[PDB]
Amino acid sequence: GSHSMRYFDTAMSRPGRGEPRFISVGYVDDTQFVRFDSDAASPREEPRAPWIEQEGPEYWDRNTQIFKTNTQTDRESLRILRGYYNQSEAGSHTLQSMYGCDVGPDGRLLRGHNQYAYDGKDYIALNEDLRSWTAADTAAQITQRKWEAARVAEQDRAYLEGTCVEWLRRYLENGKDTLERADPPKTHVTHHPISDHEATLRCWALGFYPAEITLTWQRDGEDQTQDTELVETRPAGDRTFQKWAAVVVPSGEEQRYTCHVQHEGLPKPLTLRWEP
């Protein structure tokens, strides 16, 4: 199927508590493979991604050097952002960025990403065209002007179409036995009375990978979007994910409700009912 590589970067100022902490976490799909942290001298490889162990000292020296450079740039960006927003030196602020690429089954670029946020709000993002920017406010229009003057979009595009796609193809080949494996959900339906005239039906999906899944309840073949309580997909801690969807139904009507489960690990969607 399709695959993605993403880095999630966070720089947080902590006045009176040293220089801003900077963290960069890399993912292939829903598998974290590396973590860089300014609080640490060396990167940390994830044990659930042993395929990254394959990389030599040239890879690590170059990535460590890039991370140190990025740490310097983001620390300087936080200082400049305080100024752009007329903020005092007293408060803690956060700068985040996410970037990476999506590739099709052929390994070709489907799309690139490069977005930034300041204090949890969109700041500036590279558009899908990989040439123009979306600036959220007047401060980000200042950055957009500096970046258009320095032709930054050309440099980010070069990374996204080049390095990003090439390295993702390499990680996928090295970790093919795991990264290309979808684990289907293990499913079951539970039933608990709420009152003498209503009961909750809960449809469970456990042990699946990747995280993308669709759980829907239907009543007489109609989606119950508004009446379904859907928890956020959660990590089990062993590479897999879990999710549930519940619906409150009139007692005696349980057989009119069917849970529909869609996941990459399944050849065709599952239809489940409560089995008393």
């Binding site: 740039t73 700068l95 970046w147 320095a150 930054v152 440099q155």
Partner: peptide, 9 residues
């Protein structure tokens, strides 16, 4: 593989 951020905000 990391991307180098040459220009700041």
């Amino acid at each position: 593989f990391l991307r180098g951020r040459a220009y700041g905000l």
